[PDB]
């Protein structure tokens, strides 16, 4: 997942959070990728598409 | 479509064999021989095709609309039958409670 964070520190702050696509596919962020900074690895209920947007509902 | 793998489909039973016929790459003699008629016959062919697809799409529209009709008739019919069965199982308990 590309750009909801600006740094791996930010993703480290937000690890384990539950996200979802706009299709309601639930998911969880797992680990920040190393070289592209705000990019991370998430796991979903099944295969999401390239035309989706993930969402971290915070308050 | 369902693309069953070759490693699976070579090891299938005899009944479960998948009849998949290959396309033809050679201009065979019967196909290069066979005559098609033109003008009035090709517009007759075009007309019969248009008529048959309009008939088939009209039938598919009609049966889809009947499916949408009868699922909601099933819904209201099941609601009325549930209300009826509730009334029966309380009237039976009334009858036996009096007798």
């Amino acid at each position: 997942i590309k750009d909801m964070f600006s740094s791996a520190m930010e993703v480290a702050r937000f690890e384990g959070a539950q996200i979802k696509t706009v299709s309601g596919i639930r998911g969880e962020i797992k680990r920040a990728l190393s070289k592209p900074e705000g990019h991370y690895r998430a796991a979903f209920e099944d295969k999401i598409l390239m035309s989706d947007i993930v969402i971290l509902r915070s308050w | 479509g369902l693309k069953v793998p070759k490693a699976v489909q070579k090891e299938l039973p005899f009944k479960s064999q998948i009849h998949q016929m290959k396309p033809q790459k050679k201009k065979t003699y019967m196909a290069k021989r066979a005559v098609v008629l033109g003008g009035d016959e090709k517009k007759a062919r075009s007309f019969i095709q248009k008529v048959l697809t309009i008939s088939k799409a009209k039938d598919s529209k009609r049966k889809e609309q009947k499916a949408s009709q009868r699922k909601e008739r099933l819904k209201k019919l099941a609601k009325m039958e549930e209300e009826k069965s509730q009334r029966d199982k309380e009237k039976k308990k009334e009858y036996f409670a009096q007798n």
């Binding site: - | 369902l2 489909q9 005899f14």
Partner: protein
């Protein structure tokens, strides 16, 4: 609608794909995802059924139709694309008459 207002059961409209993210056309929503997912699941179900039949082939399986039906080099099934009431190769006097 027993105690509901018609200004309360309004129509919430659905949102489109962002114009920056527009080359991946049509942001898909939950009805599109369930149309995707149940298609994938029925195709995986029939693939799993065919894999189980391949595991339980029982290679001492004789039919009488495995005299006529035959198998190509890779092991798959040859399905003759012409007929099965005709013959693909026609005789010399038939070719004489057609020519």
């Amino acid at each position: 609608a027993k105690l509901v207002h018609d200004v309360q059961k309004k129509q919430h409209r659905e949102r489109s794909q962002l114009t920056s993210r527009s080359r991946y056309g049509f942001l898909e929503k939950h009805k599109d995802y369930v149309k995707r997912a149940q298609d994938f699941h029925r195709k995986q179900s029939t693939l799993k059924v065919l894999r189980e039949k391949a595991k339980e082939r029982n290679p001492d399986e004789y039919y009488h139709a495995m005299h006529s039906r035959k198998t190509d080099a890779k092991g798959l099934l040859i399905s003759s694309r012409h007929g099965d009431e005709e013959d693909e190769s026609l005789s010399m006097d038939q070719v004489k008459l057609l020519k």
